[model samples]
Target: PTSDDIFEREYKYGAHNYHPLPVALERGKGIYLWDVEGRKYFDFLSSYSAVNQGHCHPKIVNALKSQVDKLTLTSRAFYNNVLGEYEEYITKLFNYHKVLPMNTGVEAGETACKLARKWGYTVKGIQKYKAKIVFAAGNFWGRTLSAISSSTDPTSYDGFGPFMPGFDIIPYNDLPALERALQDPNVAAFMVEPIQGEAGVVVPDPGYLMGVRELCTRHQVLFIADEIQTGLARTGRWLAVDYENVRPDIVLLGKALSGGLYPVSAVLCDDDIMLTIKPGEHGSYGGNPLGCRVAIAALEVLEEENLAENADKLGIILRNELMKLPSDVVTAVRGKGLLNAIVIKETKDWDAWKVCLRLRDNGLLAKPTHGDIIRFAPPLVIKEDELRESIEIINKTILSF
Candidate 1:
C-alpha cells in the first residue's frame, strides 16, 4: 500500500493523539529507516531515544525469537522460569535490591510513585493521605491522569481534571526550590529526571543531582530518578545520574531497555522501599518472560558494544559542529551524549517544523519538539562516517532553507 493510504487509514481508525511526521516508515536497521516507498533516510530521533542500540538490533531480536515459542507470558498466579533470572541480573546490574518489572515507561513511573508514597506513610510515618510527591516544572513522564496532575504543561493537564492531588511542583535544577518543597513534613519523595528528555533535552547544572540527593537526605524524602529516556546509555552513561554517582532511592528504567524491540520497563529500589507494596498491587504483564529475556539481551548489547563510549565521543562532535551553524538559523545547542536538540531561531515564515520537512526530503529524519527546537538524537550505534554525513545533510538542509 502507498504511504498516503497507510496514513489515511490510520487517521480514520486510530485516536488522534499524536501528530507524527507524514513519512510512513516501513523498516529500520541500525541508524537508518526506509519509507513505505523504499526511500531511505538517516534516523536522527531514534524513536525518541528508545532505539539506543539501533533499530532491529540482531542480538535483541535473536533473544525475542528464541523466547516466543518456549514461553512468553505467565500470569502472576503462576511462577515463571525467566522472570527470576531477569530479576537477579537486572537488580545486580543496577545495584538495586529488587526490581518491579512492568511493560511500559509510564507504568514504571507510576509504580515508583506508588512505592514512594507507601514508604512515606509506612516508613517515614507521614500522615495518611498527606504524603506528597515533588516534580520539576517541565517534566514529561506520560499522559496518565496522575502524571498530568503533576504536570505544569497546560497542554497535558488542561481539561483533564479534577486532577489527582498530592503532587507538588518545583523548579528544575534549583536546590533551594527543592529544599523549600521538602521542608513540608508530608513530602513523600522528589521525583526528577537527570536530564529532562521531552523538555527539549534540558540538562541541569553540574552539581544538581548531588544537591538533590543531599536535600532529599536531609529532609528524609525519597529521591526518585525517572531515567526512562536518559537511562540505558542514552546519555553516554549507564544512567545519567552515574556522572555524579548520586544514587536515588527509587530509579525508573525503560525506553531502550529492550532496544525498542519490546516494551520492557522496571522500577528499581532497595528491599525496604519495594516491599511496602503488598502482593497483588501491580500489573499482570509486569514480569513476562519474553520481555525479560529480550531486556537481558538488550542490556548485554550495550555493555559489550560500548555504545555509551560511542555516544560520549560522538556527542562532542555533533554539538561542536552544530554550534557552528549560522547563528540566525541555529540559535542554541544543548544536551549530553546522543540526546540533543538545536534551537531554531524564530522567523516570520520559517520554523523548526519546516526544517524537519526539509531534512526528511534530504534523506535524514528528525522532529521538532516545540515550535522552534529540533531534537537530533540519532542511534547510539551510528558510526563516525555516518554521523558526519548526517551532519552534512543537516547543514545542507539548513543552508537551503
Candidate 2:
C-alpha cells in the first residue's frame, strides 16, 4: 500500500542479496522515477544500471508492445524472423563476423569466456581443459561462479566454494602485469571492462585499451572487452572501446542493449573464435523475437536521437561543474561521458550514504557505488536543463550536508 510497507514485504519475502536504498520506485518515464509515495526523483543511476534511452521511453515501449502480438521466443530450436535480422544488424553494426546472443550481461561475459577457452584448445593448440582466462582486478561482471572466479573482490568470492578454475586476475591499467599474465600459453582470453563501472567508475589511462589490443594480439589471446555497462552510447561512444579507436577480438554488450526494457545481451567475435561453439552448445530464450525487436528499436533511439553525442556533450558540463565543488567533501570527479562518479570524503558521521540520502530527499536519486564513491549516470536522453537541475541538486546536497 505504501513505500515503507512494500519495503517491509520485500525484506520479509525476498532474498537479501542487495542492500537497496530506502525507496520503492513505482513508475518511470524518460529520465525520472516516482516513488510509491508519488515523490518524483531525477534518475541518475539508470544509465549505469539499465537505461541509456531513459526509463520507459516511448520508442522502446512501442517496440515491445508491437512484437508481443506476433512472436516472443522460438528457443533457437527453430528459426524466427526477427532473430536473423537482429543478429545480422548487430554484427554488422559492431563489425563482428558473428554474434552469440544471451539474456544478461554476465551471460555475454560467460559466453565470451567459453568461446575463448574452446578456441584455445582447438585453434591455439593448448591442452584440453587446461585453458585459462585472465581478467582485470576489481571487475564486476555479475555474480555467477564463473564471473566470481576471475574477480579480485573478496566479497564476491568469500562464501563461494571451490570457485571456477583456470582464471587469473591482473592489476587493472597495468600493462606489464597484463604481459606477464599473457606469457602462459594456456591463457585463452583477457576480459576487461572498458571503464570499471562497479569499481566506482574507474576510468583508465587514455591508451589502456590500445595497449590491451596490441598485447593480446602479440600473445595470441582473445581480448574480450565487456561493454555491458559502458556500451550502447552510455560512455559517449557506441562502445567504450571506440574511444581509443581500438578493436578487441571479442566484444561483450548488454545493459542498455534494449534500453533497459528487456534483458538482452550479446557477444561479438570473428568466425574463428565464435565458431568454436557449435551445435548442441548453447541457446535458451536467447535471440528471442520480442527481445530482438525491442533491441532494434533501442539501438535506433541511440542513433536517431544521437544519444552518444549528447552523452559526450553533457559529460563535459557535468565534470566541469562537479570539479568546482570544495575539495574537502568532493575529492575527485572522474568518468567519461554520462558514466561518472564523484569521490566523497568520508568522516565518522558523514559519508556517501548520507550524501545519497540527502540527494534522495532533495528530489534527485543516485546511489553510491562504494562507501566513498557515488556514481551519477543519468539517462542519455537527458536535456541540458534537466542535467543542470540535477547537477544543482547534487551540488546543494553535498554542500548542505
Candidate 3:
C-alpha cells in the first residue's frame, strides 16, 4: 500500500498523540531509511538515538533470531541461563554491582526512583513516604504519572493531575539551584539527564555534573544519571556523564540496549541501593533471555566496532560543518558527540518544524524540539563520506530558507 493509504488508515483508527513527519518509513538499514515509495533518506534522528548501532544490525538481529529459536520469556518465576550471564556482563561493563532490568527507558527511571526512595528510608534514615526527589526543570524522562509529576513543561503534565508529590524541580544547568535543592535533608535523589536530549540537546555548563556529584555525596543523596537516551556509544563515550569523570550512584540505560531490536532497559547501582526492592515489585518481562542476549550482542557491537570513537570523531566534523553553514536562520549549534541540535534565530516568527520539513524534502530526516531547535543525532555507524553528504543536504536546505 501507498504511504497515503496507510496514513489515512492510521488517522482514522489511531489516536492523535504524535505529529510525525510526512514520510512513512517502510524499511531501514545503517543510517538510511526507505519510505513506502522506496525514496531513501538519511535517518538523522536514529529513532531518538535508539538505533545507535544502526537499523537491523546483523549481529544484533542474529542474536535475536537465535534466542527466538531457543527460549524467549522464561519469566522471573524461573531462572534463565542467559539472564545471569547478561547481568554479570552489563554490571561489569558499567562497573556496577547489580542491575535491575526492565522493558523500556521510563521503567528504568521509575525503578531508579523507587530504589532511591527505599534507600533513603532504609539506609539514610529518611522518614517513610516523605522522601523527596529532585529533577531539572527542562528534563524529559517519560510520560508516566510519576515521571510527569516532576516535569516543568505544562504540555506534558497539564491535565494529568493531581500530580505525584515529593518531586522538586531545579533550573537546568544551574549549580546553585541544585545545591539549594540538595540542602533538604529529606531529598533522596537527584534525577537528571546528563545532556537533556529532549530539551534540545542542552549541554550544561562546565563542572555542573562534577558539582552535582560532590553535592549529592555531601548530602548523602543518590545521583541518578538518566542515560537512557545519552548512554551507550551515542555520546562518544560509554556514558555522557563520563565526560565529567564522576561516578553516579545509579545509572539508567535503555533505547539502544537491545540495538533497536527489542525493548530493554536497566538500572545499575550498588547492592545497598539496588537491594531496596524485594522480589514482586518489578515487571514480569524485566530480564527475559531474549532481551538479555540481544543486549549482550548490542554491547559487543558497540565495543568491537568502537562506535564511541566514531561518534567522537564524526561529531566534531558534524558540528564543524553545521557551524560553517552560512544560513542567517541558524543561531547556534550545541551538543557533544552525535547528540546535537541547531537553534533557530527567528523562533518567534518562524518554526524549526518547517525547517525539518524542508530537510525531509532534501533527503534527510530530523525533528524539531522546543519550537525552534532541530536535533541532528545520526547513527554512530555513519561513515565520514555519508556524514559529509548529510551536511551538504542540511546546508542546502537551510540556505533555501
Colliding residue pairs in candidate 1? none
- Determine which window of 10 residues in candidate 1 has minimal summed lDDT: 277-286
CA lDDT of every candidate:
0.92, 0.91, 0.92
Q: Which residue ranges in model 1 land beyond 4 Å of their true spot?
A: none
lDDT of 3 by residue, 152-242 (tens): 8899999989988999998999988888888889999999999999988999998999999999999899999999999998989999999
- Native-vs-model 1 lDDT? 0.92
TM-score of each: 0.99, 0.99, 0.98
Query: In candidate 2, what are the lDDT values of residues 1-401, reduced to their tens digit?
Result: 99889989989999998888898898999899999899999999994657899999899999999999998887877889998899889989999999888999988888888898889999999999999999989999988999888888888988896889899988999999999999898998899999999999999998999999999999999999999999988889999999999999999888899988899999998998889888998766889999999999998899999999999999999999999999988999999999999998899889899999999999988988779999999999999999999999998898896
Residue 28 in model 3: shift from native, Å?
0.4
Q: Kindly provide the TM-score of model 1 when superposed on the true structure, using C-alpha atoms.
A: 0.99
Provide the lowest-lDDT 10-residue window in model 3: 344-353
lDDT of 1 by residue, 132-192 (tens): 9999999999989999998988999999899888999989999999988888999999999
**RMSD (CA, Å), each prediction:** 0.8, 0.9, 1.1
Error of 3 at 209 (Å): 0.8
Q: Could you tell me which residue pairs clash in candidate 2? A: none
